[PDB]
Design a protein around this ligand. Structure first.
Ligand SMILES: Nc1ncnc2c1ncn2[C@@H]1O[C@H](COP(=O)(O)OP(=O)(O)OP(O)(O)=S)[C@@H](O)[C@H]1O
Ligand SMILES: Nc1ncnc2c1ncn2[C@@H]1O[C@H](COP(=O)(O)OP(=O)(O)OP(O)(O)=S)[C@@H](O)[C@H]1O
Ligand SMILES: Nc1ncnc2c1ncn2[C@@H]1O[C@H](COP(=O)(O)OP(=O)(O)OP(O)(O)=S)[C@@H](O)[C@H]1O
Ligand SMILES: [Mg+2]
Ligand SMILES: [Mg+2]
Ligand SMILES: [Mg+2]
Lengths: 316, 258, 322, 441, 258
């Protein structure tokens, strides 16, 4: 056994989610009442969507979750046939529930559901909405056919602020007695960009291999260009100096050309020292190079032109 | 020792034959259970055939059913279950209070084998129709195995089968493209075997045409009664009925355009 | 008769060069019964496939085929294969020995997002009984939901050390000699990809071999894998910097057509040979790297070999007015 | 208890907000059907709805199509026999099912019988442009029924101009439903509110409709979010709950464009309270609309961020350029399901950067994206110009047609005597004219 | 002379045998010896493994001097095996290092010689592994009485749980449309020993399987009229089909259930 902490400390109630407060409360209220509309919860990876819906599911059905909730995710069969039978049969199912409660059908990773299937789902959730309500969870609502979209409320989720990520991070630290450092935590936050799952996963991998969670250890499992170096390369007063950092500390040490750019962008973004106008013009450059890296031309040369163009701006 | 409904079919095979009798034209059906017995009507998917059942308390080795309860169930599922039970088995219907499901207990003489299945009920908003005993222009009756053959034969020729009752004579016709099909049978009564006799109580001629598909589906009740009653009237759906020792399975088929 | 590239494939973990930090951690993980889901990512020919194959042997020995399930881009792995075959193996106990099962998904980055998503959901539901190892050249081509599910081990380009070592091995079990700075050339040109080294090395063990005891030179290598040479390259620069256009335009036009070179190659080499000069003004560096970087980019899309060349001469020349 | 779209679903065609013209066109056809039949469907009345066995309804989501068809049927006493995408409508099952009711009467039509149609069917083949691989040959068999039916047949779809729908072209009376009128939806929504015990600024009730692009079903659902979210509404709450609701659940795409375009966030001070990291993050709050939103109104602001001595115009051109670049980036992101790692750059190039160049005071007001519906117009018309080409290809690429079919307009619209002359002398028919008339218009 | 001389008492024997493999197993290398035939193989999923043992006692004559390796495809073989009348005798014939095996059918009254050739399948695999030899529970019932219980429940779930409790063999299935449970006990009918059901228990057993396989298993019901089943927690279940001189056994892996 090796219980992942992302699973072990998965919020079991709407309360524990450090989500988007505003929206979560909206759910808390639907949990108390019961007029849960069909809904499409969309947002970036690991911010608490799948957790969210399942938590709403319980506080609504209590001991009924077992027979009143039907979950179907990407690991299950969800084609025309299942939609026209399993799902339909469920909505037609008889289940005596309190006044304002309805059976819930949870379709997670809904952006993987073929259109034809979604198309055959339409009528079912329209005809049986009086006993059955649907919850769609995805990263791209764009992949949900409009007919289904007009049938439900769209709840957008936002990435988790560093504060929020930090809180649930400490909560786990106490329950696991993990030896940490402030800089160590700043390293996780910095490398999770609003993704709680990602953060926790790293945290554990960090302790699992170094026990003590310090910046040095954290960046070891991450194994990406150390932020400090990347920074000292973007701020080098001489273009000659920074090209040396790229030659000695980055390229010669075997980091991916994609690895370099990505971190460069991440670091440029948090470069409070510089000015908004400036960080953005740089980003614009780092990105241009990045896309070049993605089109195949991920050469040393490219990275050099990047730093070169940076200096041109940070000198003008 | 925990139910509001507890019937015990004399013969397990019965309830199966009763449901295989119409589980091809109807999917969801509400079974109204009360003191006297079980009653249930359901309209076709194409809304052309109305199906009415009636199971009298005399078909169960024991029938309880305290309060009146509705058992809305999907015949395809229920059919999968009944398929389980073997020969020497006493199927027992069981339903609690305000059910979400229903139990089907398949016991055996030798109390060393017990098999019970649970079946989740359906929520059916049945458009309850007002079936009223009418006076049909003609009322015949004949062996179900014969009506079957006739219907199966003619259906190979046309999508429509015309049933004509003229001058105390039963005539079935099918006019297709490949050719036509005509069958005529005259009433009689064989004292040797009363069950092979063709009856016929005409009061007025009748000329109706039915969709071959629906007759091919109705003839499936030819496993419940060795005879089939047919009542026809120019201004009403035909009525095909099969008799059960304690009830019946009847079909109301709407005709085609003139 | 396997081409060297395959012939010298690590049979065990102790035969993998330059990925020690990975081998050690992984092995410790197994010995301590805390093997997490694995993601082996890195460029071509770094030892990724060699490593799990070996790791799998070492762990199961011969019960391998009946305890390990491996799929790769050559296999069909759409959503159906995931909920079925993969999912089945992940939720079913072993038939022989007791323990956890192992599923290897090679070149996982070749999988579609739909499949990846389904894969991930499977890995989530059966993590408490089965172990997954995902392999890829780019983590970024992997769904965050999938990546976030495993511990990562980046396979970096083989360091001089490692590659020098393997070169030594192949030279023994093969009547072959490699001059001093010729081994060095082979290195500098393989960009840490052990695969390209073993390839050229046999493109010589079947080229120069006559007395079965010849000596491979810098040339034999530079020409083999059609790549410039300091002298040539470092010469083309001079013609561009000093000589007139017509003359330089000739030098380049000959050096590349007489050696089968391509601007792409020349440019790169020049950028580095030029990166050591002590230019006058900083803009010289900038505009230089800029235009050169632009040229290289337009080529990757096929523009006009002729113009793009004159462009290089122009860029290098223009920028040197300081 | 029930969803609002349900409890407030029309009960008479006297409650279908909009398309009243098309509803009429529908109801009529369903009235003169018996006669059209009596006359072998060869007498195209003053409406044309006389040579058609079946009608083909079509239009955007949640605008009343399914409500009308059902309602128009229940109003003329007919009984309804419907099917939709949730059913298997393959040629096989189609021919083994409904094919049999095309000339049959309702068995329910008897136990219900003064009804003059009670014993007749109106076949509603709904969601027809949803028939997938689970309906092999469905459209074909369905389009064949439109010719051989003996009872009213109503088909509904969202995209009539699709390839899969081709087989339906000449075979039926296709009545179009467009996006209902704002006043209709505004009026309707008001009525709802009043009965739901609350009030809302006509500016809020107005922008919703604009966001919903006319989806009356969506607005209703979206409008049931307030009372369902809060526990108890009060006298004062009404005016303030709109905020938390509007800036979160409802018009969130606006509060994003707002924040993004507020110059206070780009000034040295706020520049560190709301960091670069936060600005970029706002993008991931709806990375779908955000780019569309900024482009929509980055030129309707009174900038407070311009460099000293920089004109409003100049700063706009810079963002214009960035908006342009970000597009190039988007296209690639959407060319490979595995390129999501470029979104941050797109955040910068499509929103944050352009914004910073003109952020400040909101001159006009935040408008929904024009691009979406504007993308419908352009598309819905390429299909027209297309079919027009695949009818004139006989007489220049489809492009050279819209850029040379100018002269034709004259000798086809000029005066409207020489009527038949030019019309027929063009090898065009009824639809060949009705179609060419639309686009040309 | 034939290095592999194998005459089956009745050609109708080797037929019922291969019917067990046929569906769940793809290719199977047959290793012959001096005491009979043996062979094994496993699912591409590595969930079920079949082990076949044919003793000479079920041969009218056996002579395989030096051991052999007969790799062959069941679908191809099962064909050749159908070309036999119920009045013929099968004879396996392979030469030194077989490049294809020979099956010979012959009568005993009329000169009719049916000789079929069959290329051999070489997969370069011969991993025969068995480790379990003592289970917490052993039970037996008629192969038909089993195959029934199996397909019944297969209708309501993808998984079937054989729960062995204090002298009670219990099969259960929980699914979407409902649940299903068949509980048969160990009983013996003095007049019908075959339909008797024996069960010897030691330690309780509880393990779920995938109906998928469980189904392909009950096809070996053609090899005999009684199936043996041995269970043991966290251990592949063994379903054996008795045969006069050998047997066909299936080793099915469970599912981690917690
Ligand atoms: N807001 C949150 N508060 C607390 N824990 C969280 C939060 N978001 C994520 N987690 C942790 O991350 C794990 C996965 O989060 P999920 O709810 O599955 O995220 P998601 O947004 O559904 O991600 P996808 O499916 O990749 S889009 C949970 O089991 C939690 O332990
Ligand atoms: N670290 C290493 N040590 C020793 N030999 C290696 C190493 N890496 C690669 N090789 C040789 O290169 C061949 C290919 O290595 P693989 O392990 O298959 O590479 P890989 O990382 O899976 O490559 P891909 O599929 O292109 S990503 C082997 O057969 C080896 O002979
Ligand atoms: N024109 C309208 N007037 C009044 N209420 C409407 C209108 N359109 C939609 N509604 C509401 O929206 C719900 C669904 O409308 P429908 O007519 O079923 O939509 P639709 O146009 O068929 O949409 P699809 O299936 O996505 S194409 C109804 O129950 C109404 O409450
Ligand atoms: Mg999720
Ligand atoms: Mg590989
Ligand atoms: Mg509709």
């Amino acid at each position: 056994l090796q219980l992942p902490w992302v699973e072990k400390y998965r919020p079991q109630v709407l309360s524990d989610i450090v989500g988007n407060k505003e929206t979560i409360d909206r759910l808390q209220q639907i949990a108390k009442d019961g007029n849960m509309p069909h809904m499409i919860i969309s947002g970036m990876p690991g911010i608490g969507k799948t957790t969210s819906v399942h938590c709403l599911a319980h506080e609504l059905l209590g001991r009924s979750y077992a027979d009143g909730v039907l979950e179907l995710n990407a690991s299950d069969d969800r084609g025309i046939d299942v939609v026209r039978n399993q799902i339909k049969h469920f909505a037609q199912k008889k289940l005596h529930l309190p006044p304002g409660k309805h059976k819930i059908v949870i379709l997670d990773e809904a952006d993987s559901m073929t259109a034809g299937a979604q198309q055959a789902l339409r009528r079912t959730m329209e005809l049986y909405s009086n006993s059955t309500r649907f919850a769609f969870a995805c990263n791209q609502s764009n992949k949900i056919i409009e007919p289904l979209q007009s049938q439900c409320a769209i709840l957008r989720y936002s990435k988790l602020s560093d504060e929020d990520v930090l809180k649930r991070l400490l909560q786990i630290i106490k329950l696991e007695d993990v030896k940490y450092t402030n800089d160590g935590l700043e390293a996780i936050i910095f490398t999770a960009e609003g993704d709680m799952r990602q953060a926790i996963n790293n945290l554990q991998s960090t302790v699992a291999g170094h026990g003590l969670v310090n910046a040095d250890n954290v960046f070891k499992i991450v194994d990406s260009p150390h932020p400090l170096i990347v920074k000292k390369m973007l701020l080098a007063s001489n273009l000659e100096d920074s090209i040396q950092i790229l030659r000695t500390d980055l390229w010669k040490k075997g980091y991916s050309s994609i690895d370099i750019v990505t971190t460069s962008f991440r670091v440029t973004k948090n470069l409070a020292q510089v000015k908004e106008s400036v960080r953005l013009e740089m980003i614009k450059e780092i990105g241009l190079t990045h896309m070049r890296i993605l089109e195949g031309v991920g050469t040393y040369l490219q990275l050099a032109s990047m730093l070169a163009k940076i200096h041109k701006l940070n000198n003008k | 020792m925990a139910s509001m409904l507890e019937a015990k079919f004399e013969e397990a095979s019965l309830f199966k034959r009763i449901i295989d009798g119409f589980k091809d034209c109807v999917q969801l059906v509400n079974f109204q259970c009360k003191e006297d017995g079980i009653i249930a009507q359901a309209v076709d998917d194409s809304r052309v055939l109305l199906v009415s059942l009636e199971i009298g308390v005399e078909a169960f080795q024991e029938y309880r059913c305290d309060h009146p309860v509705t058992l809305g169930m999907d015949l395809t599922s229920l059919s999968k279950i009944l398929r389980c039970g073997n020969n020497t088995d006493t199927l027992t219907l069981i339903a609690d209070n305000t059910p979400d499901s229903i139990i089907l207990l398949f016991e055996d003489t030798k109390k060393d084998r017990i098999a019970e299945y649970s079946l989740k009920l359906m929520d059916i908003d049945a458009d309850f129709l007002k079936i009223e005993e009418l006076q049909y222009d003609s009322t015949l009756s004949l062996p179900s195995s014969e009506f079957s053959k006739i219907v199966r034969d003619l259906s190979q020729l046309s999508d429509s089968i015309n049933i004509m009752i003229t001058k105390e004579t039963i005539k079935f016709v099918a006019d297709g493209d490949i050719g036509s099909g005509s069958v005529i049978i005259k009433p009689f009564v064989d004292m040797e075997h009363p069950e092979t006799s063709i009856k016929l109580e005409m009061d007025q001629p009748v000329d109706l045409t039915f969709g071959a598909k629906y007759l091919l589906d109705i003839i499936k009740g030819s496993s419940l009664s060795d005879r089939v009653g047919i009542r026809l009237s120019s201004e009403a759906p035909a009525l095909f009925q099969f008799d059960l020792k304690s009830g019946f399975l009847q079909f109301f088929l709407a005709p085609k355009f003139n | 008769n396997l081409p060297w590239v395959e012939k010298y494939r690590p049979e065990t973990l102790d035969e993998v060069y330059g990925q020690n930090e990975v081998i050690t951690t992984v092995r410790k993980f197994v010995d301590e019964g805390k093997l997490p889901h694995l993601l082996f990512y890195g460029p071509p020919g770094t030892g990724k496939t060699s490593t799990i194959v070996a790791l799998a042997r070492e762990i199961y020995g011969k019960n391998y085929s009946n305890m390990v399930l491996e799929l790769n881009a050559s296999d069909d792995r759409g959503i159906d294969v995931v909920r079925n075959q993969i999912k089945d193996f992940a939720s079913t106990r072993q038939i022989f020995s007791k323990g956890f099962k192992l599923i290897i998904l090679d070149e996982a980055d070749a999988m579609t997002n739909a499949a990846q998503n389904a894969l991930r959901r499977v890995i989530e539901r059966y993590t408490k009984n089965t172990r997954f190892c995902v392999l890829a050249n780019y983590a970024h081509k992997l769904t965050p939901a999938l990546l976030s599910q495993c511990t990562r081990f980046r396979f970096q380009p083989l360091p001089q050390e490692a590659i020098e070592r393997r070169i030594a091995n192949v030279l023994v079990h093969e009547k072959l000699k490699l001059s001093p700075n010729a081994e060095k050339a082979l290195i500098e040109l393989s960009n840490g990809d052990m695969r390209r080294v073993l390839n050229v090395l046999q493109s010589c063990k079947a080229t120069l071999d006559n007395p079965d005891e010849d000596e491979i030179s810098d040339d034999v290598i530079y020409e083999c894998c059609g790549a410039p040479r300091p002298s040539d390259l470092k010469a083309v620069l001079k013609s561009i910097l000093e000589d007139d256009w017509g003359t330089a335009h000739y030098t380049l036009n000959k050096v590349r057509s007489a050696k089968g070179l391509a601007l792409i190659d020349l440019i790169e080499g020049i950028v580095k040979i030029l990166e050591d000069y002590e230019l006058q003004n900083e803009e010289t560096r900038v505009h230089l790297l800029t235009k050169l970087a632009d040229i290289e980019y337009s080529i990757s899309k096929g523009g006009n070999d002729q113009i793009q060349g004159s462009a290089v001469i122009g860029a290098i020349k223009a920028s040197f007015e300081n | 208890d029930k969803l609002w779209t349900v409890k407030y679903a029309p009960t008479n065609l006297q409650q279908v907000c909009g398309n009243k013209g098309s509803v009429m066109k529908l109801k009529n056809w369903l009235a003169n059907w018996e006669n059209s039949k009596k006359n072998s469907f060869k007498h195209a009345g003053k409406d044309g709805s006389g040579v058609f066995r079946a009608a083909m309804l079509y239009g955007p989501p949640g605008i009343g199509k399914t409500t009308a068809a059902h309602l128009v049927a229940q109003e003329l006493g007919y009984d309804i026999l419907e099917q939709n995408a949730s059913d298997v409508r393959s040629k096989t099952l189609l021919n083994a099912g409904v094919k049999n009711a095309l000339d049959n009467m309702s068995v329910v039509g008897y136990f219900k019988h003064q009804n003059l149609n009670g014993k007749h069917f109106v076949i509603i083949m709904d969601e027809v442009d949803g028939m997938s691989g689970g309906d092999r040959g469905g459209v074909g068999q369905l389009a064949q029924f439109c010719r051989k039916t003996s009872t009213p047949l109503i088909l509904i779809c969202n995209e009539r101009n699709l390839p899969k729908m081709r087989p339906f072209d000449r075979v039926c009376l296709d009545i179009q439903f467009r996006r209902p009128d704002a006043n209709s939806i505004k009026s309707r929504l008001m009525t709802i509110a009043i009965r739901e015990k609350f009030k809302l600024d006509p500016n809020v009730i107005d922008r919703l409709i604009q966001t919903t692009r006319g989806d009356i079903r969506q607005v209703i659902n979206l409008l049931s979010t307030i009372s369902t979210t809060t526990k108890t509404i009060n006298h004062e709450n009404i005016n303030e709950i709109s905020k938390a609701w509007e800036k979160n659940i409802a018009l969130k795409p606006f509060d994003i464009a707002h924040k993004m375009l507020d110059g206070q966030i780009y000034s040295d001070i706020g520049s560190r309270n709301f960091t670069l990291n936060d600005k970029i993050a706002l993008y991931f709050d709806d990375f779908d609309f955000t780019p569309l939103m900024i482009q929509e109104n980055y030129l309707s602001t009174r900038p407070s961020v311009l460099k000293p001595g920089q004109s409003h115009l100049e700063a706009v051109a810079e963002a214009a350029n960035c908006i342009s670049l970000g597009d190039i980036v988007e296209k690639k992101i959407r060319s490979s399901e595995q390129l999501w790692s470029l979104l941050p750059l797109h955040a910068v190039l499509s929103s944050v950067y352009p914004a910073s160049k003109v952020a400040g005071h909101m001159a006009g007001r935040i408008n929904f994206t024009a691009w979406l519906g504007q993308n419908s117009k352009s598309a819905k018309y390429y299909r027209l110009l297309q079919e027009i080409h695949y009818h004139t290809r006989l007489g220049x690429x489809x492009x050279x047609x819209x850029x040379x079919x100018x002269x034709x307009x004259x000798x086809x619209x000029x005066x409207x005597x020489x009527x038949x002359x030019x019309x027929x002398x063009x090898x065009x028919x009824x639809x060949x004219x009705x179609x060419x008339x639309x686009x040309x218009x």
